[PDB]
Design a protein around this ligand. Sequence first.
Ligand SMILES: [Hg+2]
Length: 443
Amino acid sequence: WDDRHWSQKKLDEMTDRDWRIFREDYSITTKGGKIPNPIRSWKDSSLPPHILEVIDKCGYKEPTPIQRQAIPIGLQNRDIIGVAETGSGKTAAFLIPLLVWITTLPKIDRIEESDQGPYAIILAPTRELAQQIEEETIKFGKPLGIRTVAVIGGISREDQGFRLRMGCEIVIATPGRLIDVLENRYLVLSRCTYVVLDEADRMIDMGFEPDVQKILEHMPVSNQKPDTDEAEDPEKMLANFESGKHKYRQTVMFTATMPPAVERLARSYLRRPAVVYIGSAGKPHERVEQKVFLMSESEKRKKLLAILEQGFDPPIIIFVNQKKGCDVLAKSLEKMGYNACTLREFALSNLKAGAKDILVATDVIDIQDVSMVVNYDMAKNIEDYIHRIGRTGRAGKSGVAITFLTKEDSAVFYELKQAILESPVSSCPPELANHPDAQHKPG
Ligand SMILES: [Hg+2]
């Protein structure tokens, strides 16, 4: 009976639905477990008074979408992959948790007599982008007494060499310049607890993968988070963030795309990162995780069962192409001891209620966001496919769409391939991407 929009409510009134609408309003898609709620406004945020004062004085009146969601994850010391393009407020999204961390260290702990390099390094692919980041970092950092030094090309080595001697809290750099400096020990990463790769896809495109690898090799290994479920446990990671000086490092990667090289970087640099993806409200394929299995038709039922046996978050939807399929597949599942609905309102209530866990259906209303869509039969055109996978929701948890492809589906391979190659939240599937039938438009 309370039908207010969330923006009419106080923070402590926010419901699950309100958070869903909220993420829809800002086009916030995520991946990872136990994502903290996004920031509704600066005032509504739990940022320290002095931090908010600097935010307010710099003029940033409202958090941008990436800032809304990434900032709270960063404040739990969690790694992040942020999918968003320059101009979207990425820089402040990563700068803010760092500034909270630095300026809240005990003075006794902020004390070091010898110069031990930066608390943070921000790596950019180009001199032009690095300077943008620098200007913004200075404007945030100076009021807070935080020093920033740029290690980039296009600047004198005297000036650069000098500035280095003075000590700093943040270094902004380009890969080529940074490796040379490390290789000559003009700078060390002894107290670095914050690693940022900005435009990692562009770094890859420029040929910087090996240099970015070699740079990682200079970070002290013993401050990396453990590779376990604990790396994305909020209670534990929050307690680690607050642990001040001795926390695990955190790493942030920003990129517009996820080709395999970028995924390699991520596997090395990051531990159980959360994904924050902004945009594509109208284009589900860009923002829904898609997986495909090529098989013969006779293999479909056993692959489905194997998938189901792995367990799922009900409800899920399985799509088939013909209504007879719908009915017979549904029977078999109820035989395997599954609660299956076929496809009026009555069906969705049970699903919504938890009664039924699996909806079987053809391309033919209105239904909740689902964790998983399975295309047991692939759609006959890419527009129907798009509409199907769109059922994981407009925003919020990416969800997963799993598609069974056979040779009878060859006429949608090229467009299916495009749908996935344009999906930064999806892994490139060489089985389809390299397939002889996915190379040219059909007809
Ligand atoms: Hg670093």
